[PDB]
Design a protein around this ligand. Structure first.
Ligand SMILES: [Mg+2]
Ligand SMILES: [Mg+2]
Ligand SMILES: [Mg+2]
Ligand SMILES: [Mg+2]
Ligand SMILES: [Mg+2]
Ligand SMILES: [Mg+2]
Ligand SMILES: [Mg+2]
Ligand SMILES: [Mg+2]
Ligand SMILES: [Mg+2]
Lengths: 95, 95, 137, 338, 52, 41
RNA sequence: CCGAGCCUGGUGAUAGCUGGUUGUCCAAGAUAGAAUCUUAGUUCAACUUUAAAUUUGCCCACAGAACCCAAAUCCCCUU
RNA sequence: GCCUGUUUACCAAAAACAUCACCUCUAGCAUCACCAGUAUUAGAGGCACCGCCU
RNA sequence: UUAAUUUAUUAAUGCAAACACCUGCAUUAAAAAUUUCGGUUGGGGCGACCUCGGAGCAGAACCCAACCUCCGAGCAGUACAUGCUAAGACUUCACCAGUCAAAGCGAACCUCAAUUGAUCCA
């Protein structure tokens, strides 16, 4: 990515990341499973159900996405009826 | 006339500022060439009797070529401006 | 424009000399009526697949004959093994029959002297080749 | 490695290589007939429609007859003094409509080379005969045998699992599962050469359709062409493998049982020398005597539909002609006397 | 071979699902569970999605 | 309007559905019977 | 010093390649693999370092881990 | 290799390039080359004098 | 160069615009321009291989290379609840992907080695 933009000197965001991943404010990154729209006719129902799910990212993948996105995408968003409002925070987490 | 359109949208410049263009803003696509448009007619007020068009003081839609090549240069017709229309209206009502 | 484009096809896209082009126009006037594209296909069929050079194509009125007849007879002989496209060196295992022996002669003489087969077989092959051309198109 | 060579052999398509070989050999073999055979091989192949006896055979036969195809097998039986395969008249190039599933859920007919049916007809499957198909696994002859009355079981073997799968699929499409369920049909992916040891003096009727140059397919299909340079070793060793397979089939067949050796090629080497070498090897190494049956009456009976190479010593050779593009097909019938 | 075909609910719902049938076989009519109607209903082949 | 059009179309289809299912099943059964009759010959 | 002149400028071109990378002292510290127009490189994993949290880590007694057709290993309370 | 000549200035002077001769192709024409020319001309190209056969 | 991408440039035509030239748009050539020329193996060739699965090597949890030994797959058949959901687990040594699945709703009262292909874009 661009660590210093030529016009502002700021760090830029890889919009390919924004187009693909959702960041929960807790720090978790959500994604769709690759191939969830491909050749479903040859996939079993269990496989299709697995593919149709929203999946969290690794620690290292989350760190990579955090580096690739700027602080604007890592803020609190109080949207009206966000389906992920509950998921935006962790509960009963021990270490 | 050749009418062209940018392939790449130019970022907004502001109110008093002038847009800043780049190499990609010099790429154009031809949206239309006016010379290929269907021909329209020119409105003229005849001043002298002319074959197959009119006699005098009658608004006529003539091919732009004829209007600009024969009638107007030779004085056989005048532009159908509001002033000419008024003048020929007085001419008509004075008869 | 029609005449000029016919001549231009014969010259630039067929590499016929000026004298050759005049002789072609003199000997095969039907070329002018024949549409472009088809004429180029006929010429290239003679040149590459049949290995006939410009002097021969002009001396024998090859462009006179129809592409259907040309393909019928030539492909019949080729599959029979009588004809053989000249190789890169321009050499053939057996000398090929002459264009006059292929096209000018009547159907019966072509089948007897050169192909050495039966009219029934030739008719079957003609129908098969027509079907193959239609399917190719 | 050496990159820059002095002269690289010209890159030939396998089709053109096969044409070169077939010219240089069959021209000598057949003299003046080679032109006609060459044009027939390079022309379209004439197909026959074998009506699936299991399906509405009468209805499909009526539909084909309306399509103006006649049952060459029926007319042959007419002057011979259970199979039905319709073919068009001599010289006709009409194509049979693609076969479709019938009311019974099985394909109405199989579009196969008519010449490929002659080996099965010559095999003469008596009612309730135990049958072997040593390597015949393209379909065709196998389906014809099953439609025949070999109710005492048929063992179809091949060394190619892909062709075994193809056989299984055609059997699913054509032969009813009720017929295929029992040991009536046993499909195997084993080597025919080992078959002499696996079973001996077991089958009353055997069909050995050895791998061959498959001249027409070699001339047409570029893929997996036997005449490509990489497969030179296989092409060279083909005669030995064919002899081994025919010997295995002869060992398997019961004493007094009948075998038919079939080949889709014109090669004298791959047909007549193969059968003769198999006879000699069987009579020497294993001391078993085999007598070649006379198929001349078969030739005369089926001459109206197929053109036969008259100058043949052992067996029969359907040669492809333009009037009847059904060949090539060599088939030799051999009864194991001892 | 087989062709992938789109069976469409005959219940008037826009529900559709893809099945496989032999190309040579007749067009397909088939009972299938319709989630919107919450009931098994007839589905009729509409169009060939692709060949396989 | 769209919701009610969808609902009434679904209602008509559902009203016709049992008869359609019965007819299709009867057609399948009669086709099988015709196949058995052909086998009988 | 021409398979495409020379000078200046873009230009601090680029180089997964070569070379170099300058005070003292102590401490921990070495290779499971996968993917890659990739095997002269890089991303992940593995290993390694640092800081922090709390709690079992290793060694390991029985018992236990397959039919077809050996050395050992895994799991493992005690210690 | 016809010949006289030409060539890799600074590793090759040659059988290589050119060469008269012969052959192929293109062009019906003027005011800046071709050309102040016009088919026995001009341009592009091959090959290599001449002579002999088929 | 019959490698890919172009025809910006010229030469032709065609259609427009004007009443042959000029301009715009097309088509065909000439001429060029930009860029590339994968990988692992094979010295006496005329190539082989690249992804997935089973077996031995690797005998007994797992893991194990090869320019090692063999064998195979790029489907087919059935069914149309082959629907929806969901604890907990496995995982080809990463990730991606791939597996199994209690319970529940709703219904009745898939198989076996592999049989495949991400994103973007249509
Ligand atoms: Mg502002
Ligand atoms: Mg540098
Ligand atoms: Mg230390
Ligand atoms: Mg000299
Ligand atoms: Mg000298
Ligand atoms: Mg020198
Ligand atoms: Mg000098
Ligand atoms: Mg010197
Ligand atoms: Mg894992």
């Amino acid at each position: 990515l661009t660590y210093f933009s030529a016009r502002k000197g700021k760090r830029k965001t890889v919009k390919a990341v924004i187009d693909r991943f959702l960041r929960l404010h807790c720090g978790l990154w959500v994604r769709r499973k690759a191939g969830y729209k491909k050749k479903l006719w040859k996939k079993t129902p269990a496989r299709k159900k697995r593919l149709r799910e929203f999946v969290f990212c690794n620690k290292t993948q989350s760190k990579l996405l955090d580096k690739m996105t700027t602080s604007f995408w890592k803020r609190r968003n109080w949207y009206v009826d966000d389906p992920y409002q509950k998921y935006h925070d962790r509960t009963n987490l021990k270490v | 006339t050749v009418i062209v359109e940018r392939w790449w949208k130019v970022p907004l410049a502001g109110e008093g500022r002038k847009p800043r263009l780049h190499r990609r803003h010099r790429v154009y696509k031809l949206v239309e060439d006016t010379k290929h448009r269907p021909k329209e007619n020119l409105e003229l007020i005849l001043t002298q009797s002319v074959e197959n068009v009119g006699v005098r003081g009658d608004l006529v839609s003539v091919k732009k070529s004829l209007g600009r090549n024969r009638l107007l240069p030779q004085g056989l017709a005048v532009y159908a401006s509001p002033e000419n229309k008024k003048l020929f209206e007085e001419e008509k009502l004075l008869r | 424009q029609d005449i000029n484009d016919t001549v231009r096809l014969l010259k630039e896209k067929c590499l016929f000399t000026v004298q050759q082009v005049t002789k072609i126009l003199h000997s095969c006037p039907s070329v002018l009526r024949e549409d472009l594209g088809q004429l180029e296909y006929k010429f290239q069929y003679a040149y590459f697949r049949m290995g006939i050079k410009h002097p021969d194509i002009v001396k024998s009125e090859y462009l006179q004959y129809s592409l259907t007849k040309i393909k019928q007879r030539h492909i019949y002989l080729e599959r029979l093994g009588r004809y053989q496209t000249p190789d890169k060196k321009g050499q053939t295992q057996i000398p090929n029959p002459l264009l006059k022996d292929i096209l000018r002669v009547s159907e019966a003489e072509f089948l007897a002297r050169t192909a050495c087969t039966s009219v029934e077989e030739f008719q079957v092959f003609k129908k098969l080749l027509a079907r193959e051309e239609e399917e190719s198109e | 490695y050496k990159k820059k060579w002095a002269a690289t052999e010209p890159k030939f398509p396998a089709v053109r290589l096969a044409l070169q070989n077939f010219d240089m050999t069959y021209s000598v073999q057949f003299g003046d007939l080679w032109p006609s055979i060459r044009v027939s091989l390079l022309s379209e192949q004439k197909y026959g429609a074998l009506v699936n006896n299991f399906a509405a055979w009468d209805h499909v036969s009526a539909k084909l007859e309306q399509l103006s195809a006649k049952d060459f097998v029926n007319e042959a039986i007419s002057h011979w003094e259970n199979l039905r395969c319709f073919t068009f008249d001599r010289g006709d190039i009409s194509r049979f409509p693609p076969a479709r599933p019938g009311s019974l859920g099985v394909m109405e007919y199989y579009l196969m080379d008519a010449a490929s049916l002659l080996p099965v007809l010559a095999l003469g499957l008596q009612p309730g005969d135990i049958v072997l198909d040593l390597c015949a696994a393209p379909g065709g002859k196998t389906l014809a045998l099953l439609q025949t009355g070999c109710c005492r079981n048929l063992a179809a073997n091949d060394l190619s699992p892909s062709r075994i799968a193809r056989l299984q699929k055609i059997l699913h499409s054509y032969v009813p599962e009720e017929i295929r369920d029992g040991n009536q049909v046993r499909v195997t992916s084993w080597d025919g050469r080992k078959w002499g040891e696996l079973e001996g003096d077991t089958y009353d009727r055997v069909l050995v359709d050895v791998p061959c140059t498959t001249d027409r397919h070699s001339l047409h299909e570029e893929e997996n062409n036997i005449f490509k340079r990489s497969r030179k070793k296989e092409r060279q060793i083909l005669p030995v493998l064919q002899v081994q397979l025919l010997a295995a089939g002869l060992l398997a067949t019961k004493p007094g049982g009948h075998v038919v050796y079939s080949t889709c090629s014109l090669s004298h080497l791959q047909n007549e020398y193969v059968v003769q070498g198999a006879i000699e090897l069987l009579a020497n190494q294993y001391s078993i005597q085999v007598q070649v049956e006379d198929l001349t009456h078969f030739r005369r009976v089926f001459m109206d539909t197929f053109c036969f190479f008259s100058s043949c010593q052992v067996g029969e050779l359907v040669i492809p002609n333009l009037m009847a593009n059904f060949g090539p097909m060599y088939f030799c019938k051999m009864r194991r006397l001892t | 071979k087989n062709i992938l075909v789109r069976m469409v609910s005959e219940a008037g719902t826009g529900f559709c699902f893809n099945t496989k049938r032999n190309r040579l076989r007749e067009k397909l009519t088939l009972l299938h569970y319709d989630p919107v109607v919450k009931q098994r209903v007839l589905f009729v082949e509409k169009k060939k999605i692709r060949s396989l | 309007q769209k919701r009610r059009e969808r609902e009434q179309h679904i209602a008509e289809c559902m009203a016709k559905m049992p008869q359609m299912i019965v007819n299709w099943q009867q057609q399948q059964r009669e086709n099988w019977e015709k196949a058995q009759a052909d086998k009988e010959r």
